[PDB]
Design a protein around this ligand. Structure first.
Ligand SMILES: *CC(=O)c1ccccc1Nc1cccc(C(F)(F)F)c1
Length: 208
């Protein structure tokens, strides 16, 4: 009953990506992916080892995990691709379930475990092939994240990028907007991929 992908039997992640499209994309269209998830049990990581990397009650990782359900908590390590300047920075997420729900998606950007930006969005299900799909596509990236990317892309050494990213995390909480129950909580930690390798990720289950 341990998960093979990022999701539960009640809500699954289908695709997730953070990207930038250059201004010259109107002609020859192209996108650059900083991170990308597209969907043998997943490895496990203890959750209290990453409490210091996210806020505390309320809104903190130890509290949502205390309230459960445990199987809905995942950790994603990203190796971001940061070699790609007034384009469009956006995030696209798509989920799937067999119940018809209205989703609330909270994204907490954190620096040194302290919330710096939060975005809360709502998306109601749309039925397709017997499955309910949720599309939060091309959500505009906060200016803070765009500036952090620009500041972070000009650092002279990649080890400095990783030193800065050591204290940069994101916490996504997806809840049933109606019933107020948590469906999927994802913790994101970041490193920079080497310029030649593209984005990469490794998904873990958060256990205790
Ligand atoms: C700035 C922000 O919170 C936001 C705005 C629009 C969509 C998503 C998000 N948050 C977010 C969540 C997960 C990953 C990322 C990433 F861009 F990969 F850093 C941003």
């Amino acid at each position: 009953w341990q998960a093979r992908g990022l999701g539960t039997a009640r809500l699954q992640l289908v695709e997730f990506s953070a990207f930038v499209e250059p201004p010259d994309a109107v002609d020859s269209y192209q996108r650059h992916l900083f991170v990308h998830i597209s969907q043998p049990p997943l490895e496990s990581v203890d959750v209290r080892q990453i409490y210091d990397k996210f806020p505390e009650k309320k809104g903190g990782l130890r509290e949502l995990y205390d309230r459960g359900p445990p199987h809905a908590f995942f950790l994603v390590k990203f190796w971001a691709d940061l070699n790609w300047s007034g384009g469009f920075y956006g995030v696209s997420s798509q989920y799937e379930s067999l119940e018809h729900m209205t989703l609330t998606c909270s994204s907490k950007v954190c620096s040194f475990g302290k919330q710096v930006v939060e975005k809360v969005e709502t998306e109601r299900a749309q039925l397709e092939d017997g499955r309910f799909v949720y599309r939060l596509l091309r959500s505009p990236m906060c200016e803070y994240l765009v500036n952090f990317l620009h500041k972070l892309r000009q650092l002279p050494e990649r080890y400095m990028m990783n030193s800065v990213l050591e204290n940069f995390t994101i916490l996504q909480v997806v809840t049933n907007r109606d019933t107020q129950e948590l469906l999927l909580c994802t913790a994101y930690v970041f490193e920079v991929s080497t310029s030649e390798r593209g984005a990469q990720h490794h998904i873990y289950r958060l256990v205790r």
